[PDB]
Amino acid sequence: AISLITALVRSHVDTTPDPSCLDYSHYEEQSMSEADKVQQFYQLLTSSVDVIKQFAEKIPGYFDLLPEDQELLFQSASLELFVLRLAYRARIDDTKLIFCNGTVLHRTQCLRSFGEWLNDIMEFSRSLHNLEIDISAFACLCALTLITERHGLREPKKVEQLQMKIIGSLRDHVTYNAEAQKKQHYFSRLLGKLPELRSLSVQGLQRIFYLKLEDLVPAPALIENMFVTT
Known part of the structure; x- marks a missing residue:
């Protein structure tokens, strides 16, 4: 069977919209209520x-x-x-x-x-x-x-x-990737991005919590699940 990193990359690719299939139906700036904008946000987030x-x-x-x-x-x-x-x-x-x-x-x-x-x-x-x-x-x-x-x-x-296996694969890939070895402990700088994401994310909960209290439209279960982490 295929390697873990190739399985991951393929999953990423298979779940990352390709340019030719993007949905532009919402791009055009049109008039819509504050309630609509929240509706759209939830929809965007959940899907x-x-x-x-x-x-x-x-x-x-x-x-x-x-x-x-x-x-x-x-x-x-x-x-x-x-x-x-x-x-x-x-x-x-x-x-x-x-x-x-x-x-x-x-x-x-x-x-x-x-x-x-x-x-x-x-x-x-x-x-x-x-x-x-x-x-x-x-x-x-x-x-x-x-x-x-x-x-x-x-x-x-x-x-x-499983985490260690994923780390291992990332480690192997970085070690032999030429462009990567051109930087100060690239690997460490890579993983160091997760804590930032965690903090960036917490800030998102605050904004989503604000929208939930505003309560212009009900919050989907998926959005409520994000708050269980408390």
Whole structure:
């Protein structure tokens, strides 16, 4: 069978909208209520998480974890995966923003719902690209956002072993990747991006919690799951 890193990269590719199939039906700036903008945000977030769900289920060894741990791990990282993919794909000095559900919008249509938090996401985006992360390293970075220690796991040790396997594959790939060895302990700088993502993500919960209290439209279960991590 195929190697872990190739399985990861293929999953990433298979769940990353390709240019020719992007959805532009929401790009055109049109009149819509504050309630509509929240509606759109929830929709955008939930359907993207559904796609991210497809990537996680293809991570070899994931289905070998108990269904309870899969759920806990997924709910706990969904927002992070969402932000990580968003930031990775976003390019500097760009007007658009592409979401893994294929939807494309103006950065300005998102500022309305994301708030200042978006700017922090773009800031993280530039950070990722400064370090230069290839698709193989990124796929591992994503799997590591999902397969990580969380409180309440039934088989924490089983989770850590998969994590170690993913780390191992990332380690091997970095060691032999020429462009990478050209930088100060690239590997360490790579993993050092996860804590930032965690913090960036916490800031997202604040904004999503704000929208929830505003309560212009009900929050989907998927969005409520993001808050269970409290």
